[PDB]
Structures are given as structure tokens and as C-alpha cells.
Amino acid sequence: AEKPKLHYFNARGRMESTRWLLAAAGVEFEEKFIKSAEDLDKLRNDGYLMFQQVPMVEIDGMKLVQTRAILNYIASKYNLYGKDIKERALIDMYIEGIADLGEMILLLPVCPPEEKDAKLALIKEKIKNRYFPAFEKVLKSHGQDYLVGNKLSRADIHLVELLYYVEELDSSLISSFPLLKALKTRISNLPTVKKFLQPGSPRKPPMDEKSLEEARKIFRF
Template structure:
């Protein structure tokens, strides 16, 4: 009997949300094994040797305990035919994905900005999204006239752009697996709120940049 992937992270989006989206797109059921809410939970994972680099997210899948977000995403995408047909397509997918990762980094860290920095960071985030990142994906689709970014088939690049923008809402959101994931009561997480920020700071003693990757 196949065991569902087990996810270890905070009860929020962060770096785990892209993993949730990719699993959902692949039609893979998963479970939130443990939400980190205390420093003690985090230290127990360390003591158990579950966090190779002392970082989350961590996903138990196929008898492995995977850490490092990109490694987890690459494994899931490769396993479920969401990573291109050859090395050239994978290179293109990686290139587009790294753009979404850059943008997602800004979105993810925005709630942790100081009050005086929030307005400036929000403006920069919007400026980068509308002038640097979104136009690239629009141009790629326009130039090759296909529905998806690479190889005219769904890949992790499409999924990650969908997570961070509304570019592909009408197309990707109608996929049965994504449609199910967007329904109320699913395992999808929303943007971080004050409670999540407080929890992250409590667990990591404000060392967020060192321990969350």
C-alpha cells in the first residue's frame, strides 16, 4: 500500500505551498504530518535527524525524508511527468521556475517586513512582478502560441507561475486536480497572517533566514 507524502512545516504558505500545489496538480494525496508551532517540535525533528540541514520544509515521500525546496519539487515533478521530455525542456523549465522563485521569495518575506519597510517592499514587489517577471511568461506564451510554457504540456513551471500570479487562472484552475485543491476545506494555505509570523519567530527565535529554506 502506497503511503501518502507527509509534510512538515508551519500552518501557512511559505516554501511548502509550492510543494502542496505540485502534489495537488499531480493528483497525489498528501497529509500535513505536523505543524511546527513550538521550538520543542523543531528541536525534536533535529534530534531525530529528520532535518538534514536543520531546515524546513521537510517531506517524507517514497521512504525518504527530503529537505531543500528545489530538491523536493524536482523529485515530485520528475516522478509525475511535470519536468519536460528532455534535458533542453528541463533547462527551460528550471529557468522559468527560478524567476518564480525570485518573485515568491519577495512575496513570502513581505509579511516579516518591519512596519516602516512594508510600504516600500510592497511597491518593489509589485514593480518587479509587473515589469520583470510577468511580462516574460506572457511573451513566451505569445511567441510560441501554445497553452503551456514548455513543450506544449503542463510542467512545474506552469504550476509555479499559477501559484504566484493570475496569468493562468482560466487555464490551469480548470484542471480537475487543481480545481479540487482550490475548493474550501482543501489543504491549500493562504498568505501568512500575524499568527503565522508570531509562530515562525517563536520556533526559530527570529533566525528565520538561517533555518527556513
Template sequence: MAGKPKLYYFNGRGRMESIRWLLAAAGVEFEEEILETREQYEKLLQDGALLFQQLPLVEIDGMKMVQTRAILNYIAAKYNLYGKDQKERAIIDVYVEGTADLMGLIVMYPFLSAKDKEKQLTVIIQKATNRYFPVYEKILKDHAQDFLVGNQFSWADVHLLEAILMVEEKKSSILAEFPQLQAYKARISNIPTIKKFLEPGSQRKPVPDAKYVETVRRVLQMYF
């Protein structure tokens, strides 16, 4: 029997958080090795575990996987969260890429200067309100189903809920003009595995703080 997946990352969200979300949605227990020192990172480099010298790193099914999208693809397919056929998989990819573009703006937010954060926040809210959320609002309205693709819970649903919650942390009223997304958020949040992940004490990480930013900068030597 294969052991639990093991996640190597910092004690924060970053590019690993969507992987945590997807594993949790699939009901898969996982372990984490929290990186806190440069020495831990250099050991992974010396061991050849980081193929492109980048995190995140996930040990799963005897593999040491890097590259966030490759890891997410594998998990989605393995746990039946990637549609029933090639066409559904393509649609899921489209929706996931859309939410990933929005989430990418938020992932970088903690590392910006105060002045740049103010500008970035405006961009996040503007794009969520005018570019991304209207798309999902229309999709849900047009096909009148509980889920985004094939009326079956998929990676696209996990990713969109994560994105909604991330933007709500920046502006709590962001869904005020999106009734379909409001109902969708409540519906997906109540799926047992998701509900468990949203409860206090889960492996979901909090909003990145100054300590997280400093750790990432120190370990990766991101000073410039």
C-alpha cells in the same frame, strides 16, 4: 505500497506552499504534521531529520527530504511534470527560477515591519509588472500554446499560476495589461487537480497572518 507523502511545516505557506501546490497538481494526496512548538522542531533536530537544521521536511518514498528545490525537483520528475527531455527540463528550470525570485519577495513580506512592507509591496508590484510577467506574456504569445513548455502541463505552469495568484493578493488588477496571462490563468486554474486545490477546504494555506508569523518566530527563535 508506499504511504502518502508527509509534510512537516507550520500551518501556513512559507517555503512549503509550492510543494503543496505541486503535489496537488499531480493529484497526490499528502499528510501534514503542523509544527506549533519549539519542542516539535527540536525533536526533528535530535532525530537527525533536518539535515541542515532547516525546514521544510518531506517524507516521501522512504526518504526524509529537505531543501525546497530538491524536493520540488523530485516530485516534478516522479509525476511527469518535468518535461519530456533534458532541454525541456532546462527551460522549465529557467521559468521556475524566475517565478521563484518573484515569490521569494512575497514569502518574506509578512515578516517585515510596517515601513518595510510598504517598500516591499512597491518592489513586488514593480518587478511583477516590468520584469517577470512581461516575459511570460511574450512566451505565451510567441508559441501560441496552452502551456509554457512543450505544450504539456508542467511544474513551470504550476509555479507560474501560484505566483500570479500571490501577486493578485497584493494587487488584484495586476494582470490588466497582460491578456495572454489572463487567459492562461483561467485555463490552468480549470485543470481538475488545480481546480480542486483552489476550492475551499483544500490543503492550500491562506495569506499569512500575524498568528502564523508569531508561530514561526517562536518555533525557530527568530527574534532579533
């Protein structure tokens, strides 16, 4: 087809950021949910997954796997990856920091109960003292509406997406970072993003106990 088919579990997981990028880009996509391990095996046996895993994203005739390979293609294809090689360097540096913090928040649900309070406290300390300050500082420096090159880029989409997850964790964290708050509002008002934020869009809900059990069953983790 002409629409990108995203293959994954019906959840946030590792496919969510791809969803935010496609939507922010204004691209319509289909989602082929993996309901059972039989489904995942069918794909593996069909030879659609190079490294046996998902996310997988049928786009432009390719069966792309590995989150970063997917995001990189999409971001490039829709002019969300900066203008030159030097801009892409700043974007990559910002979004890999975002991806680091985000990987911590993502694994929190499957964190050992005895650790959960410490991991959560570690994460709040990195947000307050390391990442938010860094990004606030970038916005404060050029005083422009966007993080890189005074134009919308994947850096803004990925950052704002993280700002929502952090809000769900503790709304007070962003309070001392006015420029980040501003960016959150600003990007949230873009017609494409605003539509993704509304009810009924393919945006996914935070994971709970019920869905986590179904997932670690199929994927086994």
C-alpha cells in the same frame, strides 16, 4: 506509509509550492504540523533534518530537505519536468525567475515597517515591468496552452500559484496580461487544481499577524 508526509508549520511559508505541486499531480499527502519548538527539536534530535531545518518531506523512503530538492524529485517522479534536458532548461529558467519574484512577496510580511511601502512598490514594478512581460511574451510566442512543450509542467503550476499571490496583492497587475489571465483560468480548471482551490483542501491562507508571531517563536526569526 505510502503517502508523503509533509513536515512544516501550519502555514504557507516554504512548503506551499510543494502542496500545489503534489495536488496538481493528483497525489494525496499527509501533513504533520509543527505546533511547538519541542516538536522541531524532536525532529532535529531524531535526525530527520539534514541541515536542522524544515520543510522536510518523507517520500519514497527518503527524508528530503531543502525546498528545491523536494520539488525537483516530485516534479520528476510525476512527469511534470519536461521531456528532455533542453526542456528542463527552459522550465528551470522560468521557475527560478518565478521563485525570485516569489521570495520577495514571501518576505513582505516580515519587512521593516519603514521599508514596507518601498519594498511593496519595488515588487509591483518588477511584476509589471520585468516578470509578467517576460512570461506573457513566452505564451505569445508559441501561442500554445502551456509554457513549455505544449504539455502541462511544473512551470504552469508554479506560475499560476504565483498569479494567485499577486492577485491578493493587487488585482489590477495582471489586467494588461491577457495570456497570463487565460493561463490562470485554464490551469485553475484542471480537475486536480480545481479541487485544491476549493474550500477544505490543504491549500493554506495568506499569513497574518497572529500566525507570524507563533512561527517566528518556534523557528526564531
